[PDB]
Amino acid sequence: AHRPARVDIAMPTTSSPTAGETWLILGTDGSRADVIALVRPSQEGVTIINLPRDLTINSKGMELDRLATTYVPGPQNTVNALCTGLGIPTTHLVTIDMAQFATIIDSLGGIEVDVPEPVRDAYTGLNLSSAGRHRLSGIDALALVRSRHPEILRDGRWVTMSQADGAQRRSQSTATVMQAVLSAIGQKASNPVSLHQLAHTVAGNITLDSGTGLSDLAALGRSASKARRAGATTIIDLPTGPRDESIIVSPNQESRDLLARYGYSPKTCRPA
Ligand SMILES: [Co+2]
């Protein structure tokens, strides 16, 4: 029976030619966006741009908010903020909560993520006792991406690191998770019996905007499969300046160019 939850979103408008189909995937935590990624299907392949949650942008005409904070008054604010601040005109919207993320990952049979060293987090409940390939469950993967204050073993002691250190490990963990998700998706796309229940469960553990079709989601998956086989599937983190070299983490020239390549510019994007 599984049907996706629906949200009415007024999609932004653009004058840009290069900005084609752009999906906004939001990992949800009065709510905060823990994960913000833009999935770009094209004729070259598929590119995923992971937008750091702590990144501050121009949310509404002459006002600044962090990406994670834009989700609080609703997805409409995040969709609008990305447009006025980064120039990304959202074509489709996917929203996944904590329980939805853990269900989806456990429906994939978990994800294989390399752990460089034993990590723990009292807040998220993360405890990885050894380094190597780990096959993380839904709850483990969620604890890894949510890891606010990761404790690590230094000089025989559990030690916390800087806020920038933790945000860097988060973008890195989300990047690994995103790749592990993509890899597990294709590995489950080989078997026929799997897909039927898998595609059914995914639909029931997702929130979509009113204008995006369950069939539009199938086309994304179809263009992603074609891009996995062609070796044209790429995941990139938005190149922001040294995180511990400024109080506020703002988009730099590197970030603007990388976004300009894919046809995103604030000057050419308009909400409502
Ligand atoms: Co059902």
Numbering used by the authors: 78 to 106, 126 to 368
From the paper:
In the actinobacterium Actinomyces oris, an LCP homolog here named LcpA is genetically linked to GspA, a glycoprotein that is covalently attached to the bacterial peptidoglycan by the housekeeping sortase SrtA.
The structure of the extracellular LCP domain (eLcpA, residues 78 to 370) was solved at 2.5-Å resolution. The tunnel is ∼23 Å in length and is lined by residues located on the central β-sheet and helices H5, H6, and H7. The surface of the tunnel contains many nonpolar residues consistent with it interacting with lipid substrates. Interestingly, during refinement additional electron density was observed near the exit point of the tunnel, defined by helices H6 and H7, indicating that a ligand was bound. The best match to the data was obtained by modeling the ligand as a PEG 4000 molecule that was used as a precipitant during crystallization. This ligand is bound with 50% occupancy and defines the exit point for the tunnel distal to the active site. In A. oris LcpA, R128, R149, and R266 are conserved residues, which cluster together within a surface-exposed pocket (shown in red).
